[PDB]
């Protein structure tokens, strides 16, 4: 994800959970040389990433 | 002469006023006369031109007695495009030629509620002016 730069990992974790009725293992942010905070979000092993991706639109 | 000492008479200022006029003012500027048929009927000299009035071009190359419907009003370019007033570009495609509204005459108005009321107001002020002169 691209995230708002003011976000904590804690806020991102809570957000993703809320939006996609999912559950996260760990959030792992960086800031692009650009100004957009990128956040790799490791989803918990019970869930698949491909399935949620299809749900949200991307593939 | 002009006596009112808050108006301008100043090339540069009136030219600036014109080319930097905002849409709603450019509506007013891009008016055109009514035909002598309509003038007689409504008691109005001229009207702001509009998307789908029927129109004759009066002066220029396209000067003719054909009554074309207006197609669109390009207020940024101070110009209107007319049904068959068009010229073939190099590659066959047609292009609507710009005609400046003042060199056009409206034969058939597109009467909505608002336009009607404008015509009623203009005719009223005219008749008040004639009564004052009498």
């Amino acid at each position: 994800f691209i995230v708002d730069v003011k976000a904590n990992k804690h806020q991102i974790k809570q957000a993703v959970k809320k939006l996609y009725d999912i559950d996260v293992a760990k959030v792992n942010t960086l800031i692009r040389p650009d100004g957009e905070k990128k956040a790799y979000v490791r989803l918990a092993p019970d869930y698949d990433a491909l399935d949620v991706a299809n749900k949200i639109g991307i593939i | 002469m002009k006596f009112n000492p808050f108006v301008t008479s100043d090339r540069s200022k009136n030219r600036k006023r014109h080319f930097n006029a905002p849409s709603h003012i450019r509506r007013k500027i891009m008016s055109s006369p009514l035909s002598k048929e309509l003038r007689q009927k409504y008691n109005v000299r001229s009207m702001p031109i509009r998307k789908d009035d029927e129109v004759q071009v009066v002066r220029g190359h396209y000067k003719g007695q054909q009554i074309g419907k207006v197609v669109q009003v390009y207020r940024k370019k101070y110009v209107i495009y007319i049904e068959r007033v068009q010229r073939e570009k190099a590659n066959g495609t047609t292009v609507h030629v710009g005609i400046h509204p003042s060199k056009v005459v409206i034969t058939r108005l597109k009467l909505d509620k608002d336009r009607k009321k404008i015509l009623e107001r203009k005719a009223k002020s005219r008749q008040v002016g004639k009564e004052k002169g009498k």
Binding site: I31, R32, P33, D34, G35 | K76
Partner: protein
Amino acid sequence: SSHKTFRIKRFLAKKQKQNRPIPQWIRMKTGNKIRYNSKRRHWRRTKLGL
């Protein structure tokens, strides 16, 4: 430098975003006087507000 502050990074980011050339559809706008961006900066020559 590879040990940036955040302020500095955010500043370098902006300059990076400003550099891109003009979108060609601009040139077709009605009242257009612009042919090329002319505020373009090449890292090797001309060296930031820094």
